[PDB]
Amino acid sequence: GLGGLERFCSPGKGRGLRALQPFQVGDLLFSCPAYAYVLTVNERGNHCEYCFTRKEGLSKCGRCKQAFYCNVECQKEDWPMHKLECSPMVVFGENWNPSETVRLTARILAKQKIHPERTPSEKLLAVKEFESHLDKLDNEKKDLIQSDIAALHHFYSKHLGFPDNDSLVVLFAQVNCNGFTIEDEELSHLGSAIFPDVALMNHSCCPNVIVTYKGTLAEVRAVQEIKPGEEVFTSYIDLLYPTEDRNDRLRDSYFFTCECQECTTKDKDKAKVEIRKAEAIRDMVRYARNVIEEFRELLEICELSQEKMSSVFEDSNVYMLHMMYQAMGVCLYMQDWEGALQYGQKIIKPYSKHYPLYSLNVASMWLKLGRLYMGLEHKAAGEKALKKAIAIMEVAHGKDHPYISEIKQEIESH
Ligand SMILES: Cc1cn(CCN2CCN(c3ccccc3-c3cc(C#N)cc(C(=O)NCCCN4CCCC4)c3)CC2)c2ccccc12
Ligand SMILES: Nc1ncnc2c1ncn2[C@@H]1O[C@H](CSCC[C@H](N)C(=O)O)[C@@H](O)[C@H]1O
Ligand SMILES: [Zn+2]
Ligand SMILES: [Zn+2]
Ligand SMILES: [Zn+2]
Ligand SMILES: [Zn+2]
């Protein structure tokens, strides 16, 4: 088990995690080593495949030239998993395209073969026990799973053979319902992983813990006081958006509707959809929500949307903020640093009011802003922004987190 915590039956939520003892803000509840994990293709060469350390001068796999490592030991330790892809990448070349979900699922299957017994990743919840919601899958989801199975068979048969279709339908469903993305300090996608004990926690829009990552290790820290017997809740989703938007995503992705305090009262809905006629507002919300999914030179789509929404929506409106954030990202890709800074400066204050006290989204925006300032020679403003990020991260990531050490070095180097 896990010290100070227990698995229990949470009414209407299946299994959950319950506190045996109190936890205060910032306390580490537990840490969970990844059961299986994969570095995203676009981050190859930036992070070690084995331990996810971000550093320059990584060593390259001599066989495939498409995996990178801290050293020969990280390389050796990753081989049981990397061998699933090493030769196939060479053989298939530009015709190697398994989805990240397929890549992760292959690693689960490999791990099951070499380590059938319960792992240190499964102290309270085992991978084989994962919820699948099999009976709730529509044709779209079932078709996607069949595509994933076809790709698994085609790309990974050398080490995995051709696993039974029925058993793979269940497993792919489980991976979708329980998989985690690993993100860096700016919430940029690093890869995907299975953290079985972390997956036990149910969702709230007023979560009492935040999950962060230290390489491939998941860490769970309190962001509210937790009393004996209280359920431990994490957020599955971006908390910026209004109640209907949040629950549409929870229904589609996780087959539940949230009944937390934020969802019951809808307290923050008004401030999120701040107006500067009822039918005009509803038509604008419908438009904004549709336009977001369309994105889900792209600046035009953002600029036109902002102008159109400006007629009804104030600047602090979450739909306005969303577009500003997307525009900022595009400017960051084009390397229009001044453009991205202008958007970031407009985002940060209203953005910080919509999120909870400790939010990774807010910390990451402060970091982006801080690094833009530093790059554009605004060192005083950069230092202040980076310190704002650190204040949140000390609670969420722990005071001793490598990210905090790095950010402090950025303050000292500038
Ligand atoms: C049965 C079924 C559900 N789907 C939909 C699933 N989709 C979302 C998940 N996807 C992933 C899949 C693998 C690994 C990670 C992810 C992933 C994506 C995002 C995002 N963007 C965010 C996160 C993340 O870490 N979210 C934070 C909370 C994670 N907790 C929640 C509970 C424990 C983990 C995790 C695949 C697509 C299907 C779709 C098709 C067929 C069946 C199904
Ligand atoms: N706030 C909530 N209300 C209802 N169900 C929830 C919930 N948060 C999580 N869940 C359930 O938990 C799943 C995610 S995995 C979390 C552990 C799960 N309760 C289990 O027994 O294995 C979701 O698909 C949903 O079925
Ligand atoms: Zn390494
Ligand atoms: Zn290789
Ligand atoms: Zn909720
Ligand atoms: Zn609350």
Residue numbers in the entry: 5 to 280, 287 to 306, 316 to 433
From the reporting publication:
SMYD2 is a lysine methyltransferase that catalyzes the monomethylation of several protein substrates including p53. The SMYD enzymes display a distinct protein architecture in which the SET sequence is split by a zinc finger containing the myeloid translocation protein-8, Nervy, and DEAF-1 (MYND) motif followed by a cysteine-rich post-SET domain. Like SMYD3, SMYD2 also targets a number of histone and non-histone substrates including histones H3, H4, and H2B; p53 (15); retinoblastoma (Rb; Refs. 16 and 17); HSP90 (18, 19); estrogen receptor α; and poly(ADP-ribose) polymerase and is implicated in both cancer and muscle development. SMYD2 is overexpressed in a significant percentage of esophageal squamous primary carcinomas, and that overexpression correlates with poor patient survival.
A 1.63-Å resolution crystal structure of SMYD2 in complex with LLY-507 shows the inhibitor binding in the substrate peptide binding pocket. LLY-507 binds in the substrate peptide binding site of SMYD2 with the pyrrolidine group ensconced in the lysine pocket formed by the side chains of Phe184, Tyr240, and Tyr258. The nitrogen atom of the pyrrolidine makes a hydrogen bond to an ordered water molecule, whereas the oxygen and nitrogen atoms of the methylene amide linker form hydrogen bonds to the main chain amide nitrogen of Thr185 and a bound water molecule, respectively. The benzonitrile group makes a C–H···O hydrogen bond to the main chain carbonyl of Gly183 with the nitrile group oriented toward the solvent. The piperazine packs against Asn180, and makes C–H···O hydrogen bonds to the Asn180 side chain. The indole stacks between the side chains of Lys145 and Asn180. The phenyl linking the benzonitrile to the piperazine sits in a pocket formed by the side chains of Thr105, Thr145, Asn180, and Ser196 as well as the backbone amide units of Val179, Gly183, and Phe184. The high resolution structure of SMYD2 in complex with LLY-507 reveals the significant overlap of the ligand binding site with the substrate peptide binding site and provides a plausible rationale for the selectivity of LLY-507 for SMYD2. LLY-507 potently inhibited the ability of SMYD2 to methylate p53 peptide with an IC50 <15 nm.
